[PDB]
């Protein structure tokens, strides 16, 4: 890779120096490197990474939409048809080596509970933003990629993890996202975001001092979602 | 180049899609190719090769100066300066290029008085943007080469334009900005930007109706800038 010659350390003080700088595709590089060393990541390492591509795909998530949209309205030339599958092209790419860095490196049958419920939201993630560009056959195999991968993620953060925990709570929101707007399941989504919301309300004597802040915000998304789904 | 194999039409609708994607490396990439046919640009092609290479230095210019601020205050090893350069020489090939674009096909000794004074506050715009990261014996050549630029722009502008013209205004704005930051000339900024407020005023008659909202836009400028600067 284009960042094998530099050191392991030196690649995670520059993937900080980028997220300072709002330099999010260099950030993603600098992390990629990181990873390809073969060593596991710490907490505040994962963060970084996950920062990385969530901003560069997010990006490219707005624009297909943009473009999406007034293809539609045509209904002018080639142009617009052009020009959209040249950013979905691209964010096929960007999706496809996350997940490749994930199978590759990260993901494993050890390590702590933190750790793979962590990669395997992750998973779930980069697999629902390829699920929305897709159309063919291939789309139904995307689908149930994601399903699963969530689903599994599920189940060890109900046997492991207190129902406070953000990790848990940003699981099980962004799963909930996945049975409104990819599976058109919306009684399923709107039943588990309020279970989530509920069973953590009932069970606040387990917050953390060094999550208040993360597990508050998600609390206050999962009631946001849950005004506009009635 | 790239684009050589793409229609002049198709290029210049795919710069405004990009622009409403916002997606502005595209954007500059297309308007280079459109530049690249040798045909002039009308009023309106201008604004969209000025917007899109605008946006693509605003963001290096801001990350540029994130950096250089963290990297005084060293004073932890090599990596700040290595990654503060490599920012620093990108930002440097996107201003050969427009200045290249500028000698190489757009300024010319005919044409319009609108078309000459826009091009000409365009080069000195990107001088300028060089100066700011500059610092040997070629800072000075750059400084002269950007003042030469803005002055003739200057000299047109006032014989050819009413005072209400939103180029003309711009120009006096952005040429005053170089004054107080570059040419550390408060006193020559402070001038400039009042009697181009206080002539546009004394000449309200002048201002059109295609025009009202980008000269108002800007007189707003000039005031806020004359309020910090006392
Ligand atoms: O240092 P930390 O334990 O990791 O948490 C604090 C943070 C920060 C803190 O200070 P700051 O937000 O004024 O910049 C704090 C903390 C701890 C110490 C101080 C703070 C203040 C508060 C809380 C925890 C913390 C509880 C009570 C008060 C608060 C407001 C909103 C939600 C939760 C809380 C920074 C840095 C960090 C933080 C996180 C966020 C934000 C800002 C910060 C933004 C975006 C996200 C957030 C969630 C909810 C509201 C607003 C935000
Ligand atoms: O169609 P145009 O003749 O080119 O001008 C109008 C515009 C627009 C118009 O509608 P809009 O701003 O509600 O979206 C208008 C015009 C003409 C017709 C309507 C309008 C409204 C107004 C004026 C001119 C126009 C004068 C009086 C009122 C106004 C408010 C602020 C400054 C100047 C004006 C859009 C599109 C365009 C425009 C430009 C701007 C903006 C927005 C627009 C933003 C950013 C910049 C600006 C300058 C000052 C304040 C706010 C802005
Ligand atoms: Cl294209
Ligand atoms: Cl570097």
Chains 1, 2 share one sequence.
């Not at 700088?21 to 990873?35: I, L, S, T």
């Not at 490749?100 to 702590?112: F, N, T, V």
């Not at 195999?141 to 994601?146: E, F, H, L, Q, T």
């Not at 699981?171 to 309020?194: Q, R, W």
Request: charged content about 30%; proline content about 2%.
């Amino acid at each position: 890779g284009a960042m094998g010659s530099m050191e392991r350390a030196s690649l995670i003080q520059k993937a900080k120096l980028a997220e300072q700088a709002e330099r999010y595709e260099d950030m993603a590089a600098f992390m990629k490197g990181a990873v390809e060393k073969g060593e596991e990541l710490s907490c505040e390492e994962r963060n970084l990474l996950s920062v990385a591509y969530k901003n560069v795909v997010g990006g490219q998530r707005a624009a297909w939409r943009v473009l999406s949209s007034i293809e539609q309205k045509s209904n002018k030339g080639p142009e617009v048809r052009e020009y959209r599958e040249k950013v979905e092209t691209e964010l096929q790419g960007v999706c496809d080596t996350v997940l490749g860095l994930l199978d590759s490196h990260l993901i494993k049958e050890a390590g702590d509970a933190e750790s793979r419920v962590f990669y395997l939201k992750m998973k779930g993630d980069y697999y629902r933003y390829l699920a929305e560009v897709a159309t063919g056959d291939d789309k139904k195999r995307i689908i149930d990629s994601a399903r699963s991968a969530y689903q599994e993620a599920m189940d060890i953060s109900k046997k492991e993890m207190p129902p406070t925990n953000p990790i848990r709570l940003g699981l099980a929101l962004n799963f909930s996202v996945f049975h409104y707007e990819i599976a058109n399941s919306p009684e399923e989504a709107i039943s588990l975001a309020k279970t989530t919301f509920d069973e953590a309300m009932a069970d606040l004597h387990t917050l953390s001092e060094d999550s208040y802040k993360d597990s508050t915000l998600i609390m206050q998304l999962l009631r946001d979602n849950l005004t506009l789904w009635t």
